[PDB]
Amino acid sequence: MHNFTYWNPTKLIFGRGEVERLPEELKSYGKNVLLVYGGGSIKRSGLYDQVIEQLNKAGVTVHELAGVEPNPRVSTVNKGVALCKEHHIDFLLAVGGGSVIDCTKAIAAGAKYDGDAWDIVTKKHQPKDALPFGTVLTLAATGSEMNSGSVITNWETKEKYGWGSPLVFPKFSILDPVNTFTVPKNHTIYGMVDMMSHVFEQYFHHVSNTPYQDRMCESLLRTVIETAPKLINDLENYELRETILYTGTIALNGMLSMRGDWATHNIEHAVSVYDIPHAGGLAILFPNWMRHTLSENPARMKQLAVRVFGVEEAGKTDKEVALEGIDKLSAFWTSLGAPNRLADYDINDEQLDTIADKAMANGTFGQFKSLEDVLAILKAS
Amino acid sequence: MHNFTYWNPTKLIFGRGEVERLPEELKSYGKNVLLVYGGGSIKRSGLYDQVIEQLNKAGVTVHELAGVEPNPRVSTVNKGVALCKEHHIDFLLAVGGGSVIDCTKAIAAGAKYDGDAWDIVTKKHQPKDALPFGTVLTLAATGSEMNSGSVITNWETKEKYGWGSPLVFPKFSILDPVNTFTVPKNHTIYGMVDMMSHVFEQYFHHVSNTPYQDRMCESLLRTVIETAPKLINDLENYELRETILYTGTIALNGMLSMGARGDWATHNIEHAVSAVYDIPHAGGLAILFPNWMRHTLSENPARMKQLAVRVFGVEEAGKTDKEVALEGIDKLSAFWTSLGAPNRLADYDINDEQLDTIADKAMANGTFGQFKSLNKEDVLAILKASL
Ligand code: NI
Ligand code: NI
């Protein structure tokens, strides 16, 4: 039983060398641009110089906000909002991954808000305006290049919250598979785990009559599973990078959600306190959430076990088939190098209660199961 | 993989009773609305009264353009543009199927053009502005609820031209499966045959490395194959209508073709046939598509083979790629015939008398098609094989 509204105004520009589309795409906007990026990777790869060149071709007056953290922080958002006020910025260009875009979304909203951007992240102020912005993507993961959501951390309060607004869809996102070539193996693996985890979140629901969405989810998982072993030992293969970029962006922010569970993400956000790799936390927690919630409807995980993970049902219960499917998932991720226990990041049980309390700060959560549940899943991990 | 730009700003509102979303969606537009619809169907079903009621809740001043033709005429577009200037229209609401939406798109562009809308249809004048419009869809799988295209007929010249513009995407389209309950058995079958055909058109290409698009196409075909036999014997089942309405939007909005150009040769040939004989579009496609598939098989048999194996359940053990594919084409043709679709030109009482004239119409713009570039001899062979 579900009604839905779909709306995605982001322009998607896909293909080799399409960073050259920046001047044509920037003509309709002002000439004061704030360039936002993360660590040294864009300068190390040469994408920085590529972009600065195109921003020069567009007669744009460029300011920079470098150093966005892998788990982006409000202090950095506030610094960028300040730069927009100081230099009368008209437009923002995020060059990097999901963290850079999530941060750019908050600066875009924060540049038309009189106060502090943490108000927006916490949903105290619903944005009424935003600067326009665009992206040049360097790794697919969560679909941020083509959705309106953003996850920001407050290092002081040790909180990490997801917010969104219809006003902070990217105007355009330039997706060049070549721009993902320098992503190293570990982050390449993290991106694929995150992509698969997002599909899982959209699959575990109780809405009857989603036959095509189910096949789209299963199709996406199969494609990533086929691609990942070939990609990780051949990181500069255009075709394999193209497939993961396509399935991480347009495929995942398609009609796959056209209601997800998202409990595993909420628990990971709470554990992340530790400032750990997001998708690393997901690889540890997701199989145990699947085990914890299997009974709510074993048919969902059973269908993944049979249609995605090649589990043979002969002489097994529906529960058995599903649990086998979870084991193959975890083994698949572990075979890529992904972690599978909290000890892999040197995390013990000391702060589990504090972590669970943060996860429950906004009440019970989850759709496949409304989640003490949090603590049990943490302990199993 | 082909470079591509994807942009589709249409808001899709989907679900039971969602026509009640109209007033909330209209708050952002002016209050002079031209309500555009076709024949008597929406009044007979009660949808017309539902819409008028909602338009009353939105404090809107309603003018109407009723009687849009199944092949909408530029004359009717011009009538709508005249109404827009006269009553100072701000917004258009299309209630109906692809014909009603296509006509509304041409009125929307024509309402900002000083001259004759036929200039827009023929691409003599490229639109620079348009009135906004929204839709309430009454037919699945026409593609117009979520794209920027429109097909308009000049009754005088007997020409039918496809045009489009980034300015005439619908602002929103309200998709309620209940609003397709009165679509009769034959047209329900036609919509599903056309939807499968459009997937085929987007699947038959020589672009390497489209594994996910391939699976999206295969997945869509499998869902329709599972749904269609049940729907035609249960025409008011919400779930079956819902699945067809949902998949029919995806099949036709471009979310399948991104990164690969479709073939569209079978559509072009059916369009040539229909310019001569007054047959249903999907009927022509059911006849022609299996024979197009046989004619072009040698271009790359692995392509139809993959459909045969992944969609049509053909076992490949001890068979050549061509045999596997041909068995798949056979199973496709049998599936369509099992729904009631025709499979030979003779089913519509069409012989070989006009095949040459039809082939010439198909070739009016030179060679066509991407999986195989067809010339006149190709068209004649496909046509004759279809008798
Ligand atoms: Ni994620
Ligand atoms: Ni068609």
Author numbering:
A (entry chain B): 1 to 258, 261 to 274, 276 to 374, 377 to 386
B (entry chain A): 1 to 387
Paper quotes:
Based on structural and biochemical studies, we report here that YugJ from B. subtilis is an atypical NADPH-dependent group III AAOR that reduces furan aldehyde in the presence of a Ni2+ cofactor. YugJ folds into a two-domain structure consisting of a Rossmann-like domain and an α-helical domain. YugJ interacts with NADP and Ni2+ using the interdomain cleft of YugJ. YugJ was highly active as an HMF reductase when supplemented with NADPH, but it was inactive with NADH, indicating that YugJ is an NADPH-dependent aldehyde reductase.
To obtain structural insights into YugJ-mediated aldehyde reduction, we determined the crystal structure of YugJ in complex with Ni2+ ions (YugJNi) at a 2.15 Å resolution in space group P212121 by molecular replacement. The asymmetric unit of the YugJ crystal contains two YugJ polypeptide chains (chains A and B), which are arranged into a homodimer. In the YugJNi structure, a strong electron density peak that belongs to a metal ion was found in each YugJ monomer, although a metal ion was not used for crystallization. In the spectrum, a prominent peak was observed at 7.46 keV, which corresponds to the X-ray emission energy of the Ni2+ ion, indicating that the metal ion observed in the YugJ structure is a Ni2+ ion. The Ni2+ ion is located between the two α-helix bundles of the CTD in the interdomain cleft and coordinated by conserved aspartate (Asp194) and histidine (His198, His267, and His281) residues. Given that YugJ exhibited high aldehyde reductase activity in the presence of Ni2+ ions and was observed with Ni2+ ions in the crystal structure of YugJNi, we conclude that YugJ is an atypical group III AAOR that favors a Ni2+ ion as a metallic cofactor. YugJ exhibits interdomain flexibility in the absence of NADP, given that YugJ chains A and B in the YugJNi structure adopt open and closed conformations, respectively, which differ in interdomain angle by ~10°. In contrast, the α9–α10 loop of the YugJNi and YugJNADP-Ni structures adopts an open conformation that increases the accessibly of the active site. Accordingly, an additional three-pointed density was not observed in the YugJNi or YugJNADP-Ni structure obtained in the absence of nitrate.
